Amino acid sequence: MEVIELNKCTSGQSFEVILKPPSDPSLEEIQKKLEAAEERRKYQEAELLKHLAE
Amino acid sequence: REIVHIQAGQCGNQIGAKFWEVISDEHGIDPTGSYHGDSDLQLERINVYYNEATGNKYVPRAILVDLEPGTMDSVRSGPFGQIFRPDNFVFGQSGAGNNWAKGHYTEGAELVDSVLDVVRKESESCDCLQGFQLTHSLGGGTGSGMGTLLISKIREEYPDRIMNTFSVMPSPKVSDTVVEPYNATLSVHQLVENTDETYCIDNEALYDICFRTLKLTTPTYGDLNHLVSATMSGVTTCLRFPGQLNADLRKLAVNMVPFPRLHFFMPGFAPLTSQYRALTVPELTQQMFDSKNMMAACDPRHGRYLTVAAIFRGRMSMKEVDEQMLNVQNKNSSYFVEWIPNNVKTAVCDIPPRGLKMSATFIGNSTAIQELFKRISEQFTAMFRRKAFLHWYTGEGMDEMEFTEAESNMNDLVSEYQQYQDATA
Amino acid sequence: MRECISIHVGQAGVQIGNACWELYCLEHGIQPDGQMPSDKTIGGGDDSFNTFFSETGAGKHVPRAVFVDLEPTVIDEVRTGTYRQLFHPEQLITGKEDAANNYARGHYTIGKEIIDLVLDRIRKLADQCTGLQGFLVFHSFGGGTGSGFTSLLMERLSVDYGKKSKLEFSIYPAPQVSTAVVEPYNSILTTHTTLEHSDCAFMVDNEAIYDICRRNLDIERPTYTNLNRLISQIVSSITASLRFDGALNVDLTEFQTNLVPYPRIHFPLATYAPVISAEKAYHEQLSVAEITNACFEPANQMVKCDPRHGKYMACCLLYRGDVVPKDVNAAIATIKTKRSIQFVDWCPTGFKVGINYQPPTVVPGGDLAKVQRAVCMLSNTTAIAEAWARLDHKFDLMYAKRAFVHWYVGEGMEEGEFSEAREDMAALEKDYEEVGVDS
Amino acid sequence: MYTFVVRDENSSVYAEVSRLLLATGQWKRLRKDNPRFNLMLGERNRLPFGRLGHEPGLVQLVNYYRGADKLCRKASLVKLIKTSPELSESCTWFPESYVIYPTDEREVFLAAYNRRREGREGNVWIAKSSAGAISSEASELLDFIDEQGQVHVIQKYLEKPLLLEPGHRKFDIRSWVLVDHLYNIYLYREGVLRTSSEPYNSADKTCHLTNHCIQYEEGNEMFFEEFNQYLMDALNTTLENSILLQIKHIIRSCLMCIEPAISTKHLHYQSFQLFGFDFMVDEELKVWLIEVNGAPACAQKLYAELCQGIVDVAISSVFPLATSIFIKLHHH
Ligand SMILES: Nc1nc2c(ncn2[C@@H]2O[C@H](COP(=O)(O)OP(=O)(O)OP(=O)(O)O)[C@@H](O)[C@H]2O)c(=O)[nH]1
Ligand SMILES: Nc1ncnc2c1ncn2[C@@H]1O[C@H](COP(=O)(O)OP(=O)(O)CP(=O)(O)O)[C@@H](O)[C@H]1O
Ligand SMILES: Nc1nc2c(ncn2[C@@H]2O[C@H](COP(=O)(O)OP(=O)(O)O)[C@@H](O)[C@H]2O)c(=O)[nH]1
Ligand SMILES: COc1ccc(/C=C\c2cc(OC)c(OC)c(OC)c2)cc1O
Ligand SMILES: [Ca+2]
Ligand SMILES: [Ca+2]
Ligand SMILES: [Ca+2]
Ligand SMILES: [Ca+2]
Ligand SMILES: [Mg+2]
Ligand SMILES: [Mg+2]
16 A cells, blocks of 8 residues: 655645556548448439339 | 428318317417417427418418318318418319229329429428328328329428328228228328328227217217327327427437338327316326227237337326336236337427326337238228229229239238237347 | 647537536636636636637637537527527537437438538637647437437547547436437447547446436436536546646546556446535535545446446546545545455556545536535446446347338448447457456 | 246246246246346346346346355355455365365465375365365375366365264255345255265265265255254254354355445345355364355255245345245344
């Protein structure tokens, strides 16, 4: 049980107490996924309008 | 935000008119379109169903459609007839003869463009349109045949908006003509493809409630439409009044419909009214889930609930509401699917309907609804196996194949409901 | 002085942001019109509160905040509220129609239409930062905006602001307060997509906040306002080291350093004490030892779980009020012998402690009693994995039948993304078991 | 009424508890995976405690204490007794035991073994493990441990057991202990002696094992009235005085020791559990704790009354319906 790194100031204090020692995707890669999803939406909508046309 | 309302045919226009009477009363709008309410919650979400014309007038965002003028003339002469926008009356003269083909293929096709013109004109004045609600019956010609044709055209022109219907299912106990099972069967297939939410209002159930519960020896259509208007006011309460849930049609569809085709709801209401005794929350919850209070003639104990949405109106104990809801779920544990966690949702609204201190409205996506579609299918097959009455339809250009396909599709729908009535976790 | 930008996404994130900035203004003496009498340097400064407020020549202290929602009704309450004078209109971004509780609708369909405008306004805040530390992102797991738009925004923030720290405050879904049946789906999806873009995330289980409100505040039916005032007390105790003079947790990097030894296990468990009813007439002030003991009561945790059956990787204690280190060490002595506090064998069994002498501030007319001392404990323990297990089980129940899946595919997602996200969560759960359990 | 679920069909006791609950007409069984239950008669392994106590409106109760495996696992029991100050290596009622891997204690075991060979003392030991369901040479022990692939305990073998006459034969004592959600400790008034029929031969595992599966009185099960009468006639003493005070003492020590780590007070769900304590008795009328079993079966005669005792004390105390067979072991 030891106390280390004690820092004091007007607003408060902080310290550490030890009890026992130890025993990304790019922008283009994003827009490809977003644009892929937009295309799957547009494809499904085109199939709908084709069906309604029939 | 905004909802565009459409009522088509005799049944569609009569229940639609009652709906506008009831909700205009709840929002404090008089028959001249003037606000005379005492609470601000009456006007907070008023624009969901009403446009505001200068002069502080509110006009229902409603479109009235029929192929014969009689019912719409009565609506113009009835109470609140002067509230509707006169340009929004769209009607023909020939009628549809209780014939689905006439509403869908021949007479209706002539009028559809004028209806879509009024629809477009209402949509253009919408800040952000949620979608459409249609009132109609499936047993006639105009609401059924032209109703579904309208839905198809609207989906073509507004594919991303929600399509919601209040659909009155025919019953031999309240039958206008023998061909009602044909019309309904043809309509159901359309609904299965082109609506997101359909409230199944079964005339058999409405009749039973008027006869048995309400003790009315001889019910009229007006008596049924009292139940229908009370229900329609209940299910739209979360759309019209401010609340913690901030509900809209798309959220309701997302949370109520686990599988796109199985979107046919069983509504319920309590207390059944046609009395000054105060109703407690346990009584409201028990009546609400009782078959006798549901407006589709199905036994919920013959299937399982996929999802449930319940709204309680009036000033009452929310803790007691939650207690009773959890309790009723535990008593009826066998009738709720377990593979959908938290599939019963409860909402509260402080404002009660007219003439009640508290009420409860129930929206159930249950597999028991298959009974309804089985009923119709049987009636259909009984006539179709002998081709009875088919000439009325072949005379309008249809072919037997289209009937065989509609029958096959509805039996498929029944099969799909059975699949999930069996499935467990 | 290094700035911190707060981003509030969706209903929960926005309303919690409201509660927080109200509380900050009370804590720093800033009035609703932005004026701060005690600030003698007009128009500028590099004080500690300047990490969260910029200054205008007119003496107004403006939050370094951005509010984002895909529909306007919630942020409109900011625009017309008590603290409306605080924010620039450019800071309150609203859409047309929300995500309808649909992750796919918030991430793909609707998010792709507004992401660049959000990033623009954020860039405008960053430009006035002499040394931006990073972002604090507030959002729900369960909402469509909260989950989907937040995950997209976190990807783009990792792109446009690499080298900057990102911390989350996440509302974990509870049936007692939930809004949608599909919230488990959105939770798994946004966690999978956000996991590698977040340095440290504080989860708040609405069930825990709800029960604390019922039990300690005698509120039978807690509202969002109650929940959010309690949550804002916890958030305030967590960000106080950034907003006040101090030596512990002075920059966002220190949260990672002190609380997160492995990057994926970055969900510290927060515990807060005491929560005392305000309408309560007779009060008694709890000691340092009593509240420090309360930090180990499962009923005061922000996420319900049992730390006794897990292992600690880091434990940090943040006190506010009348507390001196002597009492802290005494209490720790008692507790270490009376509680089951096992650490992983590859980490020290210490406690990093911080004390702010200013006692917790409460909203006037709120439901929280003003106390003389309080503590928030942040500990990274494998026990929190229980919450993931819970969530994952719910996901499994629905996904075995593909229930509701069509609403996501209909927006452009693919069924494969569900399984990918679920496999990531299974990996996360396995990681927690490897770090915390013996055979 | 009350909902409950069953996730352990193999359970002998809770098959009968499951029987009774329906017999009151006020308990309804559910499917295994329906999470809207008041009670869970759950599984032995992988029991998902993390998913308990999160159902709104439900008070949830489970028939197992999370973490009570430290008591009901042999190496865990030995480690728990050596490393707990409340018990300690000094405690008199647990035979000297060591844990050996094929955190290890292979050096200190032999370190004492030499101290016993040199002292000419009785140097017989037994090796066993949790998976299973005796020698004088340590080499023969450790070589037997390395041939199986699991952690094993080596414990002193009690060379001077008390022997029932007529027969000159060994026994073991089984006591059933119910711990409820409030951590009250209830000792079932009826224990059993599980005896050996072949005379003890201190010079063949059957003579030295009491287990029943390996095996005067019906089914080698002697009950407390008879063992008490025998103790009076043969040794001029009672079961209470000579043995039962020590049994109660050991039960209390073990359970109080782990209470702070498994207690469900202040938790979001509540636990109870039925335990089977297995004790040994030497010729000085000293009681030795042999092992603790977390999922024990009962004696066929004692299934009734006892299962009704679980329902009375453990289940209906939390979920009430429309003379005590238990001895409450007091504690603080
Ligand atoms: N604690 C707390 N939780 C909230 C609050 N608002 C919403 N929630 C929770 O957030 C979840 C729903 O997410 P929302 O934030 O409302 O949804 P959203 O991000 O606005 O996205 P949409 O689907 O477009 O409405 C539910 O689990 C609610 O319990 C709030 O103010 N405080
Ligand atoms: N140190 C010792 N001295 C004498 N006999 C011992 C002993 N250790 C074990 N035994 C004998 O071995 C038998 C079983 O040993 P063990 O402790 O593995 O019980 P067990 O788990 O196999 C039966 P249960 O599952 O019903 O508790 C006991 O009945 C006892 O008679
Ligand atoms: N509930 C109710 N059902 C009606 C009403 N009017 C007609 N129906 C039913 O609707 C079906 C007839 O369709 P109808 O609307 O009259 O024909 P349409 O004008 O061609 O649409 C039959 O099932 C009738 O029982 C009504 O006002 N209320
Ligand atoms: C799974 O259950 C749910 C069901 C519906 C919703 C969303 C909106 C909603 C909409 C409603 O009508 C417009 C409504 O009843 C009047 C209602 O009652 C609770 C809720 C959210 C859910 O989690
Ligand atoms: Ca014509
Ligand atoms: Ca035209
Ligand atoms: Ca300044
Ligand atoms: Ca990063
Ligand atoms: Mg008619
Ligand atoms: Mg929202």
